[PDB]
């Protein structure tokens, strides 16, 4: 009786699992690794910090390799809880990574929002929100420090730690653009908030200090890294109407082996708004009450999973005029793609199409090389904007091909592509192999 | 058209990903493993079981190796929903692990709370809460069996299973201390609950039964395991006040390669209270209404992510008087460190500083060896306790450097360190390589 | 005179005008004071 009675229940069907065994589970071997230490060091920001300003920093040579980078901001609330939406992210309009004077990469606040929407999840996403927003119903005048991690290839894993030590003759810089306005901090919709404070900013870089063996090798030997980059093109949405299903063919000026494409439609007025506004409990300012308006979101609840307020009916990607895959509905891109490939939950209005088995990982797993595609095009069909957004019944009881009349406010389209390039470093200098 | 239209788009940039391929993702070879079986066997507990008692159990020799250990408790609610907080965790005040007559490790109820608060996440964290508390609005008299998994190194991975088989002359024992009181079970704040049931306790050990050759090897060959240990000392907190920012230099009596430090401040009266009480929802008993009293927590909602109620303004760690890293704010340790190193969400009042790239894993990834550091010191700066906790506006709309007047109740400081040691087992005996 | 105008770079004699660019390779480690005041006691067993 007991576990031994299972062990003896052994025969031919077990050979495939345990015959001529190779491994066990009950004895582990850890690998010995090169000695290193990690330190979080503050960088000096040049330029004036404030809303709408451009500032920058040259990463100091204090350690050998760099990994994580966090931009801290101190913001204050210009209104009560519910008036902000990830404002630290909205503020950091963009970040540009420059090495040796070459643009290696560049992120935008909207990418940070899109990235989060697709790749962070569960409590990571919640903890992530806690570092960029006010999530405990804070009130006007509240002050908090926010931490916006950067998401450049070397900021996600030690595996790609940038070997500043191997770049003896090159600069490494971060250029940061701060938004002219941040919702619930210095502006409320279009209105400025009198007395709003200017942000305090600090950027931190986590350095790896190597022991002699590796410090020596990194400085002396050439390196090659397979890294990722973000490509981004902004365009106008073929805005849908109550009288028609707008359609659009967007030529995609992308290059390089692309892991995936991602896109969203948005109202540029309101950061993170990828859906229509409606008088349903979480879809607009004052929703559910007599004060409800479908011209302004309940900012703290800007994001939603209610696809009824999204505008993509269907889409396909064409490569050199040929369909890549059969046309699928917007919900395929919003719900199925990330189910199958990421395992997180993507909010309405954000779409993903992967060319990779694991778009969320570092390891390449299938790519579409746009450097060899003369004409790649994204083909979109929009929903019909005929639903009266001020009547929750109209929204909640609607059909697959329609959306809110207020969905016509989502006039901006952001198309992203994440691709793989090669960073090469030799004799103190480096940059990327392909343009 | 279709997938073939992508394969054709091949060029120089693809060679780096797919040229001279090593693997395919579409054919997996699974490793053949040894033949083993797992059985859950109940252990006998010596000593009276009840609140405040110390009991012990010797692990039987039913199998060859042991992994998981789960302690069962049966408790009845001494009050209504909202009166308890992780009561089974509170009850298991501590547990000692003795192998071969030598202490290997020791955990405390607060460690279980800290550990969970810091390293578990998402659904695993919720399932854990389900096994240690009442989370379905149970009422007074409700009876529930709780499970408190132990978190010793051999309870985390089968790879570190204790080879009872290779410990022929050495006993393995568990010593447990049961709390004198458990909130909402036998006491309500300081008051006893007459008639409260005494706990029923039982310890379960999951045994591994190995087949013929693997058992032989374990019994005869020497083994060394790289395992984790918890170091812990309780300290007096340099309690903050409305009139000042307290500060404190705490010399840390730690040794061994340390993956990380973790700490919290708490109100020793209220288990798991790491934050100040306030009249905001969940922050005190009756919070948000007329009866709100900021002297007692809403026990069922004792924990929170509302940083305003935390007391750490900033901190740093010094080695031999030298700063290890630049001083960072309390929210760095609470939100950022976990973001970077764990990926979960850590409750306010709970802090982490890692010396490791991935401290949450089994595999060492950089450590601080305190056996080679003469003076390791944790330097803390506290927030000013000037906020009138009974006035939500005072709390929710305030600045970064202040907290609740009730934050001065968090007078206990718990500092932990998680390190590595080596468990050497051979010739019928075993114990740790270093002291 | 000649007006040498020495550039940046430490860890070498005065005959080198510049050694590193933005990141010189020369790095120094702290002496790890009171290293002798640490015993590093090994662990032992009990009578089985």
């Amino acid at each position: 009786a007991g576990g031994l009675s299972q062990l003896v229940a052994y025969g031919a069907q077990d050979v495939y699992l345990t015959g001529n065994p190779q491994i066990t589970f009950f004895k582990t071997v850890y690998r010995r690794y090169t000695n290193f230490a990690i330190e979080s060091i503050q960088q000096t920001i040049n330029g004036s910090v404030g809303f709408g300003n451009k500032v920058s920093t040259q990463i100091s040579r204090n350690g050998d390799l760099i990994t994580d980078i966090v931009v801290e901001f101190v913001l204050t609330k210009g209104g009560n809880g519910g008036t902000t939406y990830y404002p630290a992210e909205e503020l950091l309009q963009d970040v540009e990574l420059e090495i040796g004077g070459q643009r290696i990469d560049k992120h935008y606040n909207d990418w940070f929002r899109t990235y989060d929407a697709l790749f962070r999840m569960n409590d990571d996403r919640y903890n992530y929100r806690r570092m960029t927003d006010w999530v405990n119903n804070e009130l006007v005048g509240a002050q908090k420090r926010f931490y916006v991690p950067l998401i450049f290839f070397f900021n996600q894993t030690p595996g790609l730690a940038l070997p500043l030590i191997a770049l003896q003759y090159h600069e490494v810089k971060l250029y940061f653009t701060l938004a002219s306005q941040v919702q619930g901090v210095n502006y409320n919709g279009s209105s400025a908030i009198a007395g709003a404070a200017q942000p305090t900013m600090s950027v931190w870089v986590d350095y790896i200090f190597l022991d002699t063996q590796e410090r020596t090798r990194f400085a002396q030997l050439p390196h090659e890294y397979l890294i990722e980059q973000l490509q981004f093109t902004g365009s106008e949405t073929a805005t849908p109407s109550a009288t028609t299903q707008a359609s659009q063919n967007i030529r995609l000026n992308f290059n390089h082996p692309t892991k995936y494409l991602a896109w969203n439609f948005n109202n540029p007025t309101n950061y993170g708004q990828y859906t229509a506004l409606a008088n349903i409990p979480g879809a607009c300012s004052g929703a559910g009450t007599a004060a409800a308006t479908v011209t302004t979101p309940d900012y703290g609840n800007t994001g939603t999973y209610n696809e009824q307020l999204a505008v993509l009916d269907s889409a396909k990607i064409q490569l050199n005029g040929q369909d890549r895959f059969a046309t699928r509905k917007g919900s395929y891109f919003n719900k199925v793609q990330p189910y199958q490939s990421i395992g997180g939950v993507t909010p309405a209005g954000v779409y993903l199409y992967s060319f990779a088995l694991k778009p969320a990982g570092r390891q390449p797993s299938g790519t579409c090389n746009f450097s060899r595609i003369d004409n790649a095009t994204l083909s979109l069909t929009y929903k019909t904007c005929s639903i009266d957004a001020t009547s929750p019944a109209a929204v909640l009881g609607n059909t697959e091909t329609v959306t809110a009349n207020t969905a016509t406010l989502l006039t901006a389209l952001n198309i992203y592509a994440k691709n793989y390039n090669v960073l090469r470093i030799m004799s103190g200098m480096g940059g990327l192999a392909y343009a | 058209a279709g997938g073939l239209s992508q394969l054709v788009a091949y060029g120089a940039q693809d060679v780096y990903l797919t040229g001279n391929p090593q693997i395919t993702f579409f054919k997996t070879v699974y490793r053949r493993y040894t033949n083993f079986a797992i059985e859950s066997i109940q252990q006998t507990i010596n000593g009276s079981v009840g609140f405040g008692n110390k009991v012990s159990t010797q692990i039987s020799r039913n199998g060859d190796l042991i992994t998981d250990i789960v302690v069962e408790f049966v408790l009845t609610k001494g009050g209504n929903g909202g009166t308890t907080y992780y009561p089974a965790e509170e009850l298991l005040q501590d547990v000692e692990l003795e192998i071969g007559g030598q202490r290997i490790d020791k955990h405390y109820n607060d460690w279980f709370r800290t550990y969970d608060a810091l390293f578990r996440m998402n659904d695993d964290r919720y399932n854990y809460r389900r096994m240690t508390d009442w989370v379905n609005n149970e009422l007074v008299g409700a009876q529930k069996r709780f499970y408190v998994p132990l978190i010793f190194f051999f309870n985390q991975t089968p790879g570190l299973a204790l080879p009872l088989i290779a410990l022929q002359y050495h006993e393995v024992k568990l010593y447990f201390t049961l709390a004198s009181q458990v909130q909402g079970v036998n006491y309500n704040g300081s008051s006893a609950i007459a008639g409260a049931a005494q706990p029923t306790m039982s310890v379960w050990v999951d045994y591994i039964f190995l087949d013929t050759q693997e058992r032989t090897r374990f019994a005869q060959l020497p083994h060394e395991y790289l395992i984790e240990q918890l170091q812990f000392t309780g300290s007096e907190t340099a309690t903050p006040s409305a009139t000042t920012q307290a500060s404190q230099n705490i010399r840390l009596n730690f040794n061994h390669p340390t993956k990380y430090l973790a700490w919290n401040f708490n109100n020793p009266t209220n288990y798991g209270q790491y934050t100040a009480l306030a009249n905001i929802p969940g922050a005190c008993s009756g919070a948000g209404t007329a009866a709100a009293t900021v002297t007692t927590p809403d026990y069922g909602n004792t924990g929170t992510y509302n940083e305003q109620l935390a007391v750490l303004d900033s901190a740093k760690i010094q080695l031999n008087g030298q700063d290890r890293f630049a001083t960072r704010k309390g929210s760095y340790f609470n939100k950022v460190q976990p973001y970077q190193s764990i990926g979960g969400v850590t409750p306010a009042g709970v802090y982490l500083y890692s010396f490791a790239l991935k401290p949450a894993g089994r595999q060492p990834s950089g450590t601080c060896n305190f056996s080679r550091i003469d003076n390791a010191t944790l330097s803390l700066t506290y927030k000013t306790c000037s906020i009138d906790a009974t006035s939500p506006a005072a709390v929710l709309g305030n600045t970064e450097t202040v907290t609740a007047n009730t934050a001065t109740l968090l007078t206990a400081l718990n500092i932990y360190a998680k390190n590595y040691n080596v468990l050497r087992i051979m010739s019928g005996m075993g114990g740790l390589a270093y002291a | 005179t000649e007006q040498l105008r020495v550039g940046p770079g430490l860890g070498v004699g005065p005959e080198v005008a510049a050694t590193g660019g933005f990141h010189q390779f020369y790095r120094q480690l702290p002496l790890n004071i009171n290293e002798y005041k640490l015993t590093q006691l090994p662990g032992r067993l009990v009578p089985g």
């Binding site: 003759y169 002396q220 030997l221 050439p222 200098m429 | 120089a12 | -």
Partner: peptide, 29 residues
Amino acid sequence: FVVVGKFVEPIPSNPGQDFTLLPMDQTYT
């Protein structure tokens, strides 16, 4: 002591011209 090699990479598909970026050792005694 720095190692300078050839950086074995695949042949470019359409062009033959690219950016060389020769190594340099910035040090003057």
